[PDB]
């Protein structure tokens, strides 16, 4: 499982964004419809791929047939079968957050997951609320503004 994380990270400009994969890092910035989820080549993914049902779920690397691979997303055969849940999010190789469907259950609330601060640094000053989601009633922690 842990060997199934696409880890093709590349800091073309040494801006320090890659530190957020191991730990939160002092960060500040002034500058701070999605397409359907298809098959994402693992070569262009850096870090875990999260999908929301609306609960966050880690999607590891698999081949195009769905068999789990354990090559850290370095082989060309490794992809992410994301066509199913409501949306997925991940980091590309050059530090851009990719979405498809994302974790926005409300125009101002978002599902909270371990790598939210990394994928969406804009939401660092958000408050975590235990909100209720109607899908059956599901309750989950959400970072809201």
């Amino acid at each position, epitope marked *: 499982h842990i060997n199934s994380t696409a880890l093709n990270c*590349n800091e073309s400009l040494n801006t320090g964004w890659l530190a957020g994969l191991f730990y939160q890092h002092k960060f500040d910035s002034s500058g701070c419809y999605p397409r359907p989820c298809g098959i994402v080549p693992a070569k262009s993914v850096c870090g875990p791929v999260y999908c929301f049902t609306p609960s966050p779920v880690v999607v590891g690397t698999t081949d195009r047939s769905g068999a789990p691979t354990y090559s850290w997303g370095a082989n060309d055969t490794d992809v992410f079968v994301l066509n199913n849940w409501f949306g997925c999010t991940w980091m590309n190789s050059t530090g851009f957050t990719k979405v498809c469907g994302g974790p926005w259950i409300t125009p101002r609330c978002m599902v909270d997951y371990p790598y939210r601060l990394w994928h969406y640094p804009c939401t660092i000053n958000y408050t975590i609320f235990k909100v209720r989601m109607y899908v059956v009633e599901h309750r989950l922690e959400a970072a809201c503004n």
Partner: antibody
Amino acid sequence: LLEQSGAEVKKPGSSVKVSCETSGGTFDNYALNWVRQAPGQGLEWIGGVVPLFGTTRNAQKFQGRVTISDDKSTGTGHMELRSLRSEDTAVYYCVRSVTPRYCGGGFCYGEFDYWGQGTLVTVSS
Amino acid sequence: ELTQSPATLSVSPGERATLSCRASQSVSSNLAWYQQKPGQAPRLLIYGASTRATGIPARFSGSGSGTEFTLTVSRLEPEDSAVYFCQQYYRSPLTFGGGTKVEIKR
């Protein structure tokens, strides 16, 4: 500040293990590598380990006879070099990197932020 | 594989010392500069070819990309007598330069 063990003297073919402790509390670093410098040569990278993923990388001169570990609870790194030869007489340094700059499955590289004072390992008969 | 020329240097205080680091192959901006005072642990000066590390005074300045790199220590002071070496982190294995021992005149 990184503090390393005292100097060592070993017979050829033996094994040496060098520790690397942190002066203060454990801090944020993603990888632990080891570097040595022979008396007439420049600095040489030996290997490294990224504890979060459990992956390791070695140089070809050390494949099969080197083992690098990093205890995150205590903040103490380790390097055991086996099958020692006289070419291994060098000052061995301990490094810890804080900001990764490139990751290839499943290892991550970058500049070395903190260095240890060094440990002389002499291999002689 | 990195190459540093010259191997030694001798510059007067308050002047400018220029060091070089040639790369046999392009390493982009994945290069770091270090300072090793005699009998001390090496100290990171520059990373990313041209970015100073935290706590590094502004008189240290690095530049270059691809295969050519240059470290510049302006307003040289006696505490700058040390060995400086470059390191690339663009490809495995990680390689260091031969070093450049600097003597401060007086």
